[PDB]
Write a protein that binds this ligand. Sequence first.
Ligand SMILES: [Ca+2]
Lengths: 48, 525, 146, 49, 48
Amino acid sequence: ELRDQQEQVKEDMETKCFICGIGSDYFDTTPHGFETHTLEEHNLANYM
Amino acid sequence: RQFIFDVVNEGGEAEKMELFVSFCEDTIFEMQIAAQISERLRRLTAREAATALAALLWAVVARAGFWGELEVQRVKFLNYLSRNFYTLRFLALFLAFAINFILLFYKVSDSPPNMVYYFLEESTGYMEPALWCLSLLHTLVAFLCIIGYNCLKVPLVIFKREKELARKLEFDGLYITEQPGDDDVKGQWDRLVLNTPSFPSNYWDKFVKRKVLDKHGDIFGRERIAELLGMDLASLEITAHNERKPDPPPGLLTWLMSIDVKYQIWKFGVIFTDNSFLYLGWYMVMSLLGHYNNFFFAAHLLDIAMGVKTLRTILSSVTHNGKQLVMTVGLLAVVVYLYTVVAFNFFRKFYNKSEDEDEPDMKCDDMMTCYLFHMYVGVRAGGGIGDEIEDPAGDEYELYRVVFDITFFFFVIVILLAIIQGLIIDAFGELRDQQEQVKEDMETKCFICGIGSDYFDTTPHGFETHTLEEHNLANYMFFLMYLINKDETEHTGQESYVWKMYQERCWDFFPAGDCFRKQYEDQLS
Amino acid sequence: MVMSLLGHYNNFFFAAHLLDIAMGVKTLRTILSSVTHNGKQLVMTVGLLAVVVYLYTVVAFNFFRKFYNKSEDEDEPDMKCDDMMTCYLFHMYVGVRAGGGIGDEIEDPAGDEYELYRVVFDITFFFFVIVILLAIIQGLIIDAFG
Amino acid sequence: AGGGIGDEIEDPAGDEYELYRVVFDITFFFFVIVILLAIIQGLIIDAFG
Amino acid sequence: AESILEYFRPYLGRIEIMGASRRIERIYFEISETNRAQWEMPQVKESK
Ligand SMILES: [Ca+2]
């Protein structure tokens, strides 16, 4: 049970922005797209 | 297949493509080294049962188990020694059984034919000298393996280290801008090899020294760079190979003392730090130490049973949770100690062995003995220490024993030992989950494109062709090999465009999102 | 057919029939398939036990010979450490089923001579070929149902 | 018995049919103790999952 | 103006909000030097 939770937090943050509601499927039409969206754009660290 | 499993198991950003290109040139050098070596009921006495069962075990294992002349011959032989291999190692395992099977018949008596370790044979007169002949034979095939290893697998790891160093000097300022990490041995040991003139030995191009001289030497001391990087007399180097191409005189077999001492010291550092080489090195000393006329050959079958595949799969489970497993044993030791002090102050009059007419042995006075008694007996008792004490039937402190024993049995027997059994049980589930994950990911993705199999199935039998006819991550290796074997002046417009960015290590020409079909949906579907 | 026909030899050979016919009903095959699902790996693990127990036999053959007696009175005509056969057979036939390792079938190590080397020898035997090795076997069939 | 019937018999030290006892006892301990009783423990363990 | 951009790259913040027009907008602002320093502490980073 505990091991299942550990992967769940890893998977959820991977395929969602945690601010946007958009999955990584849409942010990959532009090559190397999703990686920039979580760093250059809203990155939940600039807000602070 | 090993490469695919590693990459997709921990996949992230564009690092994936960099690894893939790295792999393509890794196997290319592998081809170079491969082509250079080709050219009622009856009575059952033990021995009978032993032979039958050992044949069963071996069958189970085997079902999944003149200076000129000098030079020429030597070369050829090292050559095919290497070639062969994977066989020899197979032969070494077989001799481990025979040398151990014979050892299984010794005898000990206090009468020579100081204890006498005389070896009694069986009914047949053989099996005494077979021990001698096989002992000499095993060391020979053992030592032969090291020679084969030192000419088949060693050049690859040297090539891997040299390649990774060249990038960190040209495209990175690791050793030149500020410093290495100054904590890892690998990042510090390699500092010795910079000055030697023969630094790029196994790597392809020997112009790496010149390339970084002009790139990072503009804003740095050209004299300063021209000594750290070796390359002494920068004027001489730029004025040496500009008039003609002289032929140096031959100095073969005469000045072998005049060699790169620095290079050998650094190279030998890489050899002794490789885990695979050390295992074979340790294999030699045990076999050689077996000539000391002992059972040291018995340590060989233990460390060679891992050769067959199925052992590594099962044996990896215990090593997968190694840090947590060894830790739990520690928690047992502190708890049992915590149970020792409480007995030391209240229950001293119980830990006796019921000796007659007196009790000269007491297991509760010394803290040593009281603690050692609990560890050596209290755990294996199967039911706690309640079976190795005086009976608490006496009303004095009667009930405090019952609570003391029961909590001991629930905690350090039922619960603590179930955690240890639970860790390896959980290990198999974790490893099996990874095995399906690599299978599923490659099924529904192109590994080059970002497109799932849902889109590539509108055309009947569509996704299967897309991974074979189109980009199939196998043509790319052929393409990159094709560029090298072609003159620069013959490159077409598209080939030269790719070849230029390959020098700069930019990986923008891989599709990564569109693969020739989204581009041409509306035009011609 | 042959077992039934051989049962007319006036023997218990009919007792071999219910064993191989209980598989006819469905529920047996579902449960019995679990052990046969990991057959190659399960039979393999037993082999790893045999080599390890043997590796524990040689170490007793050179140091702990004066412990493997049966406390016979007035003499000890039986020794379980001289023959490599008996020393190995004693460990296999008893040392595994003892439930706690061979520490319960030896002379007491209370004598200070080589006293502590027995403690380390017995404990590692109990952790490795009892707690761990036999838990792998129990863990394989448990994993089979999942 | 916790270890099969090997603890509740006459000692097989006598060479007459000596080894047939060893094979008889060991297979009993592996089959109806280690394996069969682990299935029963494995069913309720699987139930919680 | 590449050299001036690279010096100010670590200091130039950027976020995204949506309001007052029912449309997405960008925001630019200065990030103080000290706030970039004490944010990257082992204690604070682990708490995130
Ligand atoms: Ca041209």
